[PDB]
C-alpha cells in the first residue's frame, strides 16, 4: 500500500465524514456520486462506499461536458478543469441540489462547496460559504468545525 | 460522442497495442506500469492487464515527486502535471529504460514518447522522435501503423 493509495483511502473517509453533515431535499435510496475530470485520489470512491446510516454510495466517472450532471449526480467530485470547463460544469449544476467537492483547492472562492487539500501529513479542506448557500442542499454548520 | 467507460476501455487496448512494439533491454517477468498525476481514463489500466504472450502488466498510481519512478516503472502513463512537476518526472526517468505515454496530446513537446488524443470517434496518438531515442527502450517504427489506422474514419 503506497501513499497515493493511502491518501485515496483517507479521501474516502473525509468525504464520508462531510456527507454526514449534508441533507438533500428529497433523500435518495442510493447516493449518486460523480467523479468528473482528471483525478489522482478518487480510486477509493470509485470502488463504492456505504454511509453509517446504511445508504449506498454509487460512484461513476462522468464527462466534463455531460449536460445532465445536475440531474445525474447527488455528489460531484471535481478534478482538474480549466476555466471554460468549470463554469460549463456548474451551469449544469445550477438549479439542482448537488454537493460539490474538488480534489484541489488552493483558494476555493469560486466553484465547489468544499475544496480538499490532500498534500501534507493529513488531509485538510476549505469551505466556500457562497457556494454552500446557493447549493440547493442543506449543510449543518458543524461541518465548518471540521475545516481548516 | 463516446462515453468515459468506453474511452477508458479503449485506452487499455491502445496501450496494449503500443506495448507490443516496445522492447526493454532486460525484459521483466511482470511489466510494471505507473499512473502518475490526475487522470480521467486510466481506471481500465489500473485493473491490471495481460499481454498476448501472457506477461502480466501490474498497474498502480505513484506520486509525481517520487524520485524512484525510473526504477519502479517500466511504463509511465502520465496525467495532468504543471511545468515543474513534468520536469521532476522526466528527470527521474533520464538514464532508465522507460516507455512514457501521456493521456493528453500536449506533452509530446516536453518529454513524453507517445501522446494520446482521447477526443473524437477513436483514440489517436502522436509520438516524439527525440524522447523515443533517449528513452533506453527500443520502439519498432510500425507502431505508427496503429496511430494512422486509428486516425482513419
Ligand atoms: N529505435 C527505433 C528508432 C526509430 C526510427 N524510426 C522510428 C519511427 C517511429 C518510432 C521510432 C523510430 C529504431 O528501430 O530504429
Numbering used by the authors:
A (entry chain B): 38 to 185
B (entry chain A): 38 to 190
Copied sentences from the primary study:
Moreover, we found that Vitamin B6 (VB6) or L-Trp can bind YfiR with an affinity in the ten millimolar range. Structural analyses revealed that the VB6 and L-Trp molecules are bound at the periphery of the YfiR dimer, but not at the dimer interface. Interestingly, VB6 and L-Trp were found to occupy the same hydrophobic pocket, formed by L166/I169/V176/P178/L181 of YfiR, which is also a binding pocket for F57 of YfiB, as observed in the YfiB-YfiR complex. To answer the question whether competition of VB6 or L-Trp for the YfiB F57-binding pocket of YfiR plays an essential role in inhibiting biofilm formation, we measured the binding affinities of VB6 and L-Trp for YfiR via BIAcore experiments. The results showed relatively weak Kd values of 35.2 mmol/L and 76.9 mmol/L for VB6 and L-Trp, respectively. The over-expression of YfiBL43P induced strong surface attachment and much slower growth of the yfiB-L43P strain, and as expected, a certain amount of VB6 or L-Trp (4–6 mmol/L for VB6 and 6–10 mmol/L for L-Trp) could reduce the surface attachment. In E. coli, mutants with decreased tryptophan synthesis show greater biofilm formation, and matured biofilm is degraded by L-tryptophan addition. Based on our results, we concluded that VB6 or L-Trp can bind to YfiR, however, VB6 or L-Trp alone may have little effects in interrupting the YfiB-YfiR interaction, the mechanism by which VB6 or L-Trp inhibits biofilm formation remains unclear and requires further investigation.
The YfiBNR system contains three protein members and modulates intracellular c-di-GMP levels in response to signals received in the periplasm. YfiN is repressed by specific interaction between its periplasmic PAS domain and the periplasmic protein YfiR. YfiB is an OmpA/Pal-like outer-membrane lipoprotein that can activate YfiN by sequestering YfiR in an unknown manner. Previous studies suggested that in response to cell stress, YfiB in the outer membrane sequesters the periplasmic protein YfiR, releasing its inhibition of YfiN on the inner membrane and thus inducing the diguanylate cyclase activity of YfiN to allow c-di-GMP production.
